[PDB]
Amino acid sequence: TTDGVYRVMTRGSTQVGVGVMQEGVFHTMWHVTKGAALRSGEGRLDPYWGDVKQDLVSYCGPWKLDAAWDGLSEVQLLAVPPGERAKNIQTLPGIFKTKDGDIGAVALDYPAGTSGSPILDKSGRVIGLYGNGVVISYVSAITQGKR
Amino acid sequence: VDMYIERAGDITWEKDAEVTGNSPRLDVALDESGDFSLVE
């Protein structure tokens, strides 16, 4: 239940993704878990909110992350790759231009087990999650939910 | 099959992070299944 970034593992064992614990709620991408329940030691986390189109899911409570890229500043991907210590990768986002407005995007390509890793602003706030994007090389949207 | 979680770190900005990656501007569409595709 501690705040932080977490590996999402499956059973040998395999890392399928990453997520963010904040304010008692676990946040990850829908395609990582498909809404399955999660074990946390002896405890169980059940899905609470999910949306395939946003590709997000929250456990134990509603989506809590609400910070947004400012459109100008560099950000940091807090990547947690399989088999590797959590590490920060700083970048200037590009932009996904859509009929419903612009979304930040990071042109960084890490293993699929890294999906769900948080993208941070300089204040340390999570502005979205890494791992839903397009191929031009892979480019990931900065995917943020609604609080 | 059961999924489980393991803590991997604090959520913190790191002053000495590696810096890399370009900043492309792309027109895209997002469909009902959550898939982004390119648009022209």
Author numbering:
A (entry chain B): 18 to 28, 32 to 156, 160 to 170
B (entry chain A): 49 to 88
What do the study's own words say?
Here, we present two crystallographic fragment screening campaigns using a 96 fragment sub-selection of the European Fragment Screening Library (EFSL) provided by EU-OPENSCREEN. The performance of this subset was validated in two fragment screening campaigns using the model system endothiapepsin (EP) and the NS2B–NS3 protease complex of the Zika virus. EP is an aspartic protease with the catalytic dyad formed by Asp35 and Asp219 and has served as a model protein for finding inhibitors for other aspartic proteases like β-secretase, a key target for treating Alzheimer's disease. As a second and real-life target, we addressed the NS2B–NS3 Zika protease which is crucial for the viral life cycle of the Zika virus but with its shallow active site challenging to target.
The protein construct contains the soluble part of the membrane bound NS2B co-factor and the protease domain of the NS3 protease/helicase protein of the Zika virus. The NS2B–NS3 Zika protease is a heterodimer, the NS2B co-factor wraps around the NS3 protease domain and forms part of S2 and S3 pocket. The NS2B–NS3 Zika protease construct was cloned into a pET-DUET-1 vector, with residues 46–96 from Zika gene NS2B and the protease site from NS3 (residues 1–177) (courtesy of Martin Scanlon Lab, Monash University) following the design of Li et al. 2018, with an engineered C143S mutant to prevent crystallographic disulfide bond formation between neighboring NS3 copies as seen by Lei et al., 2016.32,33 The NS3 protease part has an N-terminal His6-tag followed by a TEV protease cleavage site. The NS2B–NS3 Zika protease was crystallized with some optimizations as described by Huber et al., 2022 by mixing 1 μl protein solution (40 mg ml−1 protein in 20 mM HEPES, pH 7.8, 250 mM NaCl, 1 mM DTT, 5% glycerol) with 1 μl reservoir solution (24% w/v PEG 2000, 0.2 M ammonium sulphate and 0.1 M sodium acetate pH 4.6) in hanging drop trays. For soaking of the NS2B–NS3 Zika protease crystals 40 μl of soaking solution containing 0.1 M sodium acetate pH 4.6, 0.2 M ammonium sulfate, 24% (w/v) PEG 2000 and 5% (v/v) DMSO was added to the reservoir. For the second fragment screening campaign LigandFit and PanDDA were used to identify binding events. With this campaign 18 fragments were identified as crystallographic binders with a total of 22 binding events. Out of the 22 binding events 10 fragments are binding in the S1 subpocket of the active site close to the catalytic triad forming π–π stacking interaction with Tyr161. One of the fragments interacts directly with the catalytic His51. Eleven of the binding events are at crystal–contact interface sites.
